[PDB]
Amino acid sequence: ASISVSYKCGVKDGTKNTIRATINIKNTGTTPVNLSDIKVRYWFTSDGNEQNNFVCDYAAFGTDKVKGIVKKIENSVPGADTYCEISFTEDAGRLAPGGSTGTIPFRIEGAAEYDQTDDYSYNSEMSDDFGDNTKITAYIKDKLKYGVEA
Ligand SMILES: [Ca+2]
């Protein structure tokens, strides 16, 4: 069982209190994987924002099947004092070998203005197309399968 994630940095704007980005999850192995077994983590510094809410903009199987929770990290490291963990509900479906979700655009919103230039998972060089951003991590059943942590 293996997966990859590809990533495009959001438009930039506009609104300084919104992190926007789009990911695509691909099954690169030889067996089907249920979406409900997959987690994606986006690692960042919340910059004093105590509240950080996740919103899913669009997903092919429905935005009501994408869940996000944002958690503070106890032992913070450079580039991450907070991560957003994206997961799927049991009815999101499954990815056959070679299958991919296509674009899932999302946003993380705060009450104050983020500085995305000190966020580990941010890569401003991937604005114009999807790239392989290995500063975003992904898991199958809680085992790391893509990217490099923290
Ligand atoms: Ca930050």
| Binding region | 45, 47, 115, 118-119
> Contact, 56 vs 108, CB < 8 A?
no
Give every strand in the sheet of 3-9, ordered side by side: 3-9, 18-27, 104-110, 52-56
Distance CA 4, CA 25 (A): 6
> Contact, 67 vs 47, CB < 8 A?
no
Q: Phi and psi (nearest 5°) for 130?
A: -70, 140
Alpha carbon of 114 to ligand 1 centroid (Å)? 5
Other CB atoms closer than 10 Å to residue 135's CB: what's the count? Answer: 18
Distance CA 137, CA 78 (A): 16
Distance CA 148, CA 136 (A): 7
Using a CB cutoff of 5 Å, list residues around ligand 1, an ion.
45, 47, 115, 118-119
SS3 21: strand
3 state SS for 97-145: CCCECCCEEEEEEECCCCCHHHCCCCCCCCCCCCECCCCCEEEECCEEE
**Tokens in use for 26?**
């691909």
Alpha carbon of 106 to ligand 1 centroid (Å)? 17
Distance CA 87, CA 66 (A): 6
Distance CA 134, CA 110 (A): 25
> Contact, 138 vs 40, CB < 8 A?
yes
**Tokens in use for 90?**
């049991």
Alpha carbon of 33 to ligand 1 centroid (Å)? 33
- The amino acid that residue 133 corresponds to is N
Which domains are seen in the chain, by residue range? 1-150 (2.60.40.710)
**Tokens in use for 58?**
């669009």
Alpha carbon of 20 to ligand 1 centroid (Å)? 13
How distant, in Å, are the alpha carbons of 51, 52, 56, 68 from that of 16? 15, 13, 18, 20
SS3 30: coil
Alpha carbon of 99 to ligand 1 centroid (Å)? 33
Angle at 123 between CA 122 and CA 124, to 5 degrees: 115
| Binding region for Ca(2+) | 45, 47, 115, 118-119
Report the candidate in 135, 125, 25, 40 with the shortest Cα–Cα distance to residue 80.
Answer: 135
